[PDB]
Amino acid sequence: REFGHLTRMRHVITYSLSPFEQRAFPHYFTKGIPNVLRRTRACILRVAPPFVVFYLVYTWGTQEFEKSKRK
Amino acid sequence: AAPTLTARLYSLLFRRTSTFALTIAVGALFFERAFDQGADAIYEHINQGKLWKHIKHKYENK
Amino acid sequence: AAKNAVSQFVSSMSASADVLAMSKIEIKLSDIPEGKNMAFKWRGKPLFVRHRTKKEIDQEAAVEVSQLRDPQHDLERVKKPEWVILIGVCTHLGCVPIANAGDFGGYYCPCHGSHYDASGRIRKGPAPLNLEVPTYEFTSDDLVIVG
Amino acid sequence: TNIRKSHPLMKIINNAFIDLPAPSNISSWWNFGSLLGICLILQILTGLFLAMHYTSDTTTAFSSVTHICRDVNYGWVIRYLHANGASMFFICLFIHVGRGLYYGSYMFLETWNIGVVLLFTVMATAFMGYVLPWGQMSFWGATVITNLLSAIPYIGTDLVEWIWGGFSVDKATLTRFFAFHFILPFIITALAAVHLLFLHETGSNNPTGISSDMDKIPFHPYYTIKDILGALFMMLILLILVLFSPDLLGDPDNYTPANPLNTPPHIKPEWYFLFAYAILRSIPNKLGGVLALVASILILILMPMLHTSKQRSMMFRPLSQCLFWMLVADLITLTWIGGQPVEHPFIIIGQLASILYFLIILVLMPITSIIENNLLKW
Amino acid sequence: TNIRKSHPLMKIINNAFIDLPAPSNISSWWNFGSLLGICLILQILTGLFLAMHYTSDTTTAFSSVTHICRDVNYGWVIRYLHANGASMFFICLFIHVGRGLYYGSYMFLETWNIGVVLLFTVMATAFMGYVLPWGQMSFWGATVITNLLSAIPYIGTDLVEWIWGGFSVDKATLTRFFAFHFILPFIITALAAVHLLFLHETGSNNPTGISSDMDKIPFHPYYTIKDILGALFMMLILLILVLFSPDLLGDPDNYTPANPLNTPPHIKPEWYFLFAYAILRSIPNKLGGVLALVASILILILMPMLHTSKQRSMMFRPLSQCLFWMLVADLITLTWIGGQPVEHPFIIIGQLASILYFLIILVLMPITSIIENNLLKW
Amino acid sequence: RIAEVDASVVREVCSKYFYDQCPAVAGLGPIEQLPDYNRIRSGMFWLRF
Amino acid sequence: LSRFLGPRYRELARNWIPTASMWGAVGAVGLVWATDWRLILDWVPYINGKF
Amino acid sequence: HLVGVCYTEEEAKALAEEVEVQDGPNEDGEMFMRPGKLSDYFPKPYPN
Ligand code: HEM
Ligand code: HEM
Ligand code: HEM
Ligand code: HEM
Ligand SMILES: COC(=O)N(OC)c1ccccc1COc1ccn(-c2ccc(Cl)cc2)n1
Ligand SMILES: COC(=O)N(OC)c1ccccc1COc1ccn(-c2ccc(Cl)cc2)n1
């Protein structure tokens, strides 16, 4: 696995700019803030509902531990 | 042209090299307990009456 | 190079001893009053050793097999009723506390409130077994060898 | 005539770190492999110091450790670098395994199987380092291993006596625990070079699960500067836990010395063993509990065989993403239960969560991938 | 489909030990390279035992070693395996260097230069292991190094104080000598893998000095069975010196404990340092004596530059063979002089033999090769 | 004669003629990669059976 | 599953189960002197192997 | 260390229960005397 022996490709053109010709910080809060809100919305219904059920079991488990030692 | 006794068990156990893989385990005996003939009978013969289990009947059941 | 160089590297890390006379064949004399358990770190745990009375085997025999789960008593394990040997190991976790604290002569575990014997017997849960005695025999006048 | 392509030693380094083809869309979750190599080197240049000034016996172990924090110069900083540096190793290891589980990296079969060996070796090492300071948590945590290790029906009673130095708690117990702790970190360093040699045959996986041979970039300078930045952020978190709260990850009862003096108010290990202590404690049989302890780590080897999806990773599988985060929330429950006393609500919870950890991996994950296969018309 | 030619780990072993092309006329002098690898492994699995039961302080060092021969089980056999196993390493090292000097193996420049580094590292290691038992020879032998180490005109007085633990003879002296002795044998193991990787680029030299690419044989089974037979003959000699005379190579005065109590009847190191102690003792200046000590080992690096013969080895050079055995007889003289007191006949002899060791290598050997070049009409 | 040959007969006759036997070898160049006779002779006996 | 199905798979495993006690009993004799298995050294009266 | 070389273990303890050396302390008291406890080095003559 060396660089000129990897795969076969035809009819593809790429254009690039030098790092000394561009800004290292482009649009940061103009593009970046609405981008990290799209990514948060796209994954919130998959990750979060398991950790809500851990919270409800934890509260029921510490409260029914203290309503056993009381009288 | 009768041969000598070097056809040991070559046609019987040693051809298919099944013996050779496990001579650490299977073909491993005859050389610990059969060598009570070895060093301990020789070492106590050079040192007769000098080890502790030679001078032993003098000091029990007194 | 299989049995005389592998299996022969044996005696420093095994039950064979660099303490070849441990303390059990040492001449043990009773510097101990009754009701006093000293923390004897002799093969690990404090071995429960003190005097004995004639009244002693009458209180453990007043509570019979109908209490227990794995029944064995004083005459089963001990040589004669003038001596006692235990280990300080709970059979699930591994501790019973300091002496002179209990109901009438046990060692009440203050972990969450269970109780245990001065002769190795189950009282409360949640441990399954009974306390283990080490193996030895009787030989002598006063030459005790516990092990 | 290029010297880094023709010198016999330099061309090994060039193929491994400089001219190596790498995918261009590699995320920050691929940073934690070189972080594990930083944490392992750091635990070696800090375990040098502690074993120098050390004596391991039943009479002096608890005081040999208190000598370093007060009397031995620069000993308070190096001791708590070592105790928190092992908590850092275990958080970088659970992120690393969960990455390869999520993106289907276990399809690299030889690399995945050497990894499962590496997870066993660091877990057994750290168990034999917490027994060395000899406090209450060192004693009662070691003496619940041997109850399930003497439960081996034939060889177990002579196995524990051979590793306890010879009888029980004594002087030479901490000469076989200490021997099994000085030398096990160096088998890990040799198992890590073999671990990377198998990955070099295919290169890396990427978050899409599709092969990336048309879009490779060199490793230098793109991921050499990205791995240096991620390592600097790890040293900031580690030195904050050492210089501002060096006892946050720990137990005060292990400052009470070891003796069979009295039963402790509780028994609990460090945080990275609390999921495993919760499983064996919910089995009322010392043979069934030692089998489910080994079956909670060696279950990772069945992950190549249980795969039924036509895709490799979980990026395009929304029903499987829900099950992955149910498994993470199940390991949080077992870490909490394993530091609780054995009472009424923490036995029915701690034993249903032990069941659901095996039900997700074996049954629920292979059926759900088949259901997603039918919905995409293959 | 041959698995030993295509598996990523098995094909490294196959190219190194099994299918490696080797000359067919290789002698028994080529056995001592794998013998050095057996002696280094043996000194690691025996130094495990000694550092386990050890305490290194000015009050208990002499008794920590006497505890092992009597009280520690199997400690008399393992201690004298370690003290005679280091004498075995040094006889297999002087044969090895004299082989490569005789047959012109120093023309493999990169392999020869890593070897000179390996000769320095084992010499400094064994010096810091004889100071550990703390007897009369341990004290007075260490305190003649620091007289020539404080003779460094700028940094030397703070150099010796940084390695003596902090002042002088004290508790912490043997915490920096012991640290510099536990870890130096593992730099040797990594320097030996690099040493063989450079030899693999050319293969081996042979006793004729002519390239042997038309007459190669595989390494297995011809030299795998020949290296096993030679290693069995080495274990016979080592176990004879351990089980029949374990104090033959040693000094009784190092059983007298260390104290500045009284000046000893003599001062002498082990046999493999007696050639070096004889050279510095014949220079009445503690800076000229520390320069000629380092110039007696680092002179080996000039051997590629001083070569003036048209042939490679010494098999066909009868005038050069006479000079090689004059050099061996000169090192026998220095080993005898270095165990003698500093009196009348042993100063004129010990300082003329120090001169002739440098006169043979630098002056007499390059001129004699040129004379033999003219006699063969080239 | 052909009809009375089966798989156990073939295993018996091939073990009689091939297994732990010394072969005769001939080679005509370029044959530098032809293996050594010790490696050819050890290829006649098997490892696992 | 028809993964490893076939009359060929247990035909080579038919002729190897005589020498597949070289898998299990060889492990049983491979742990006689590597372990010092105490109560199965009296498998024979022959091994009084330690004093 | 004398047992099995030139003495059996009785004939050995009696030579240790013949010299009197100083043991450690005990509470309700101070430094007391208790002779040979079967594992004791041979007694030095000089205190310094
Ligand atoms: C001491 C422990 C470990 C070290 C030093 C280590 C090191 C590394 C490194 C440097 C990489 C390449 C960079 C990366 O992708 O992060 C890697 C990748 C990988 N590791 Fe580990 N690792 C360790 C433990 C483990 C464990 C416990 C597992 C699994 C059970 C594992 C499985 C993998 C896999 C599958 C990959 C390739 C992932 C991919 O490319 O998608 N490793 N490891
Ligand atoms: C994978 C690497 C390592 C891990 C995970 C690890 C883990 C640990 C742990 C958990 C402790 C207990 C600290 C405490 O409870 O206060 C410890 C301390 C200790 N470790 Fe390690 N360690 C590692 C490397 C090493 C090395 C390389 C050595 C020896 C050279 C070593 C020897 C010791 C010693 C002697 C202690 C003494 C107790 C103390 O000083 O706190 N460990 N280590
Ligand atoms: C720990 C120390 C050493 C080890 C393990 C070691 C190992 C080896 C081995 C295995 C070989 C190949 C087999 C042989 O020809 O004997 C070899 C060859 C060689 N060694 Fe060493 N060696 C060590 C020290 C040295 C030293 C001190 C020198 C020289 C100053 C040296 C120079 C050479 C040379 C020049 C060769 C090639 C000789 C030839 O093929 O004619 N080595 N070494
Ligand atoms: C190249 C390898 C080695 C060499 C040449 C070497 C050499 C020596 C020497 C000359 C002694 C003095 C013995 C005596 O005078 O009675 C010694 C003892 C000692 N060595 Fe090593 N050794 C090596 C490997 C090791 C290793 C790997 C360790 C630690 C893991 C180690 C640690 C010690 C210690 C602590 C002692 C003192 C115990 C004693 O004096 O008996 N050495 N060694
Ligand atoms: C830092 O050390 C501790 O937390 N230790 O041990 C001193 C401790 C202390 C108190 C109570 C329990 C423990 C240990 O609890 C567990 C639970 C599972 N493992 C385990 C160990 C090794 C392997 Cl391979 C696999 C699993 N250990
Ligand atoms: C086994 O140890 C001894 O023989 N040691 O040292 C405790 C001893 C004991 C008494 C007197 C002298 C010595 C040492 O004499 C020499 C003479 C030369 N080196 C030397 C050391 C390191 C290096 Cl790199 C190069 C040369 N050492």
Ligand code: FES
């Ligand atoms: S005493 Fe251990 S659980 Fe009750």
